[PDB]
Amino acid sequence: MEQRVVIATTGGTYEKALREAWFEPFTKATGIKVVTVSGTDAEKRAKVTAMVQTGNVTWDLYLDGEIQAGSDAHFAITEDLSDFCMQFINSTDLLADSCTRGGAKLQSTSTLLAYKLNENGSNPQTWADMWDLAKFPGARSFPNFDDPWRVLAAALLADGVPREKLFPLDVDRAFRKLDELRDSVQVWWRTGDQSVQAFRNDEYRVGQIWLTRAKALKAEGYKIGWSYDGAFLVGDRIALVRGAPNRENALKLIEFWLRNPAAQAKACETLSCTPPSQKAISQMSSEARATLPSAADVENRIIVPDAQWINANMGMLVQRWNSWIR
């Protein structure tokens, strides 16, 4: 009779957008207070695990990447949402896999093909064009962070593998394709800042970067474009902590998000992400919509991760990549 919900986020700008669009409206509609806790994704994972081994569960919900939400490790410290998830098949508004075992989709971000606009107007539109140095010359750029699955999947799509037949990834073929391009890759960005600096300095003309960083360059006045063909849409899931103190209230907060396109659209206008609702995508301001994939791009051209495969082949991938990079 003094109801609350405790949710963990990365804090900052992300938390602020969620407070304005999701937490305060919820509290106003229900009377249930939303207590927010900040920390890194690794800190949060470790804090949930420690809480689950002790009986002392302080947190009800936490956000984490969909691939981590995801792993057997995640399922060991979180509740299976599968039963709760069934109630969201009353609508086809929500995009595919919006409610899984590991959690509900909050928002998704794109990793896509971005390019500097050339004078003749001929720009690369597919991953195959990124490999076409004849028609599209210049320096390439790919991320060089520990998991290469998106770099490997871009290579496979460039090599003519259709998106429906993409997973399981042919790792041997993906590396064979990467070798053809590897001499042209002048930028191996580890941070978003590096891919942004490299573009400002004109260190690359064709690259795989985050839509968030491509948007920021266009807003700074740079002659940048991007393509949604074979773009990787990866997001965060809202997970329910194993035996959360306020379990019921935590699920009301989840339902509030999934059933509210206005809440999703407001939060995703602020953060420049793709919400799970098709209504929320179309409901966003014209200016926001202009720099984001449409619902038809998401269902017909975007690549969605196979979390089961990525988690199972994770160790092998990191080993094989670090060795390939030398």
Radius of gyration of the chain from Cα atoms?
20
- Report how far residue 257's alpha carbon sits from residue 84's, in angstroms, rounded to the nearest whole number: 14
- Among residues 150, 142, 318, the alpha carbon closest in space to that of 233 is found at 150
**Distant-in-sequence, close-in-space partners of 125: CB < 8 Å, separation ≥ 6:** 113, 227, 229
Q: Are 62 and 48 a contacting pair, CB within 8 Å?
A: yes
Letter string b/e over residues 288-315, b meaning 16 or more CB atoms within 10 A of that residue's CB = beeebbebebbeebbbbbbbeebbebee
Query: 317: closest CA among 71, 145, 75, 69?
Result: 145
The DSSP line for 16-50 is: HHHIIIIIHHHHHHH--EEEEEE--HHHHHHHHHH
Residue 95, Cβ neighbours under 10 Å: how many? 21
- Three-state SS string across 118-176, please? CCCCCCCCCHHHHCCCCCCCCCEEEECCCCCHHHHHHHHHHCCCCHHHCCCCCHHHHHH
Sign of CA dihedral 293, 298, 301, 307: positive
- Residue with the two structure tokens 């999701």: 22
| Residue in the block written with tokens 């520990």 | 146
User: Determination technique for this PDB entry?
Assistant: X-ray
Strand 4-9 and strand 33-38: pairing? parallel
Mind listing the domains of the chain with CATH numbers? 1-109+234-326 (3.40.190.10), 110-233 (3.40.190.10)
- Which resolution in angstroms does this entry have? 2.5
> Residue 321 to residues 143, 178, 317, 325: CA-CA distances in angstroms?
12, 11, 6, 6
User: Tokens 């791009």 belong to which residue?
Assistant: 297
Q: Which two structure tokens, joined as six digits, stand for 5?
A: 């919900």
Kindly state the DSSP code that residue 95 receives in the 8-state scheme: P
